[model samples]
Target: SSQQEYLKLKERYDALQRTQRNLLGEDLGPLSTKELESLERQLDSSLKQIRALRTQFMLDQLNDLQSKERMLTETNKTLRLRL
Candidate 1:
């Protein structure tokens, strides 16, 4: 699995890129168009990877939940059988 914190860093990185132009204006003086484009591409790639990770995470959580539900149901069945 990807590093757990990758998701959070991915989120922050993407958010930063969302306003990268503004950020660059204030923080990174006179960035060339090429540099800006490159940064944008990198950000896009990170966003895509993050999205994939999030999907996987959701699936994992859902499966975990289903397993718990099944276990509870089985426990309930066993208790009822004893009664």
Candidate 2:
């Protein structure tokens, strides 16, 4: 049932949050070397992906501004020529 699935998903979400907290260096006493290594790799990959996404967002914003600037410049030039 959907309700049952929701409860299961919530349980998993809670567990993931716990692990994420541990991965951030708290309560790490119980983690094995393998687990720590795996978490480190996952964090590294996540950071790289986040950086890439951030770069893409910035580029998109810059392109939008540049396009706006071009339109405004063209309009200004057209108006100047009319004067």
Candidate 3:
């Protein structure tokens, strides 16, 4: 069972790597026009998803930092009152 799992996972990994290579603009001669168009569509969708996730991540980080800054400012103000 372990060996079978290893084989399956490895096969998937290899296929994924092959697809990545094809996506990276390498070895175009082996692909048909339809295949190329499919790959292009996939890449475009991936790019859009990646951009949206990145933008959301940046906004979340900014919100987190702002919250932290507000907490730190309250602490500083309290500390000043004691001094």
Instruction: Identify the candidate with maximal TM-score.
Output: 2
Candidate 1 residue-wise lDDT, 1-83, digit = tens: 67978998999998787566544445455567886787778878988999999999999999999999999999999999998
Query: How does model 3 fare in lDDT?
Result: 0.94
Count clashing pairs, candidate 2: 0
The residue-level lDDT of candidate 2 at 76 comes to 98
Compute the lDDT of residue 81 as modeled in candidate 3: 100
What is the C-alpha local distance difference test score of each model?
Answer: 0.82, 0.92, 0.94
* Two-way lDDT contest, 1 vs 2, winner: 2
Model 2 lDDT, residue 53, Cα: 100
**Which stretches of candidate 2 lie above 4 Å from their native place?**
1-14
Q: Lowest summed-lDDT stretch of 10 residues in model 1?
A: 21-30
Candidate 3 residue lDDT tens string, 13-74: 99888888898898678888899999999999999999999999999999999999999999
The TM-scores of all predictions, comma-separated, are: 0.52, 0.73, 0.62
Clashes of each: 0, 0, 0
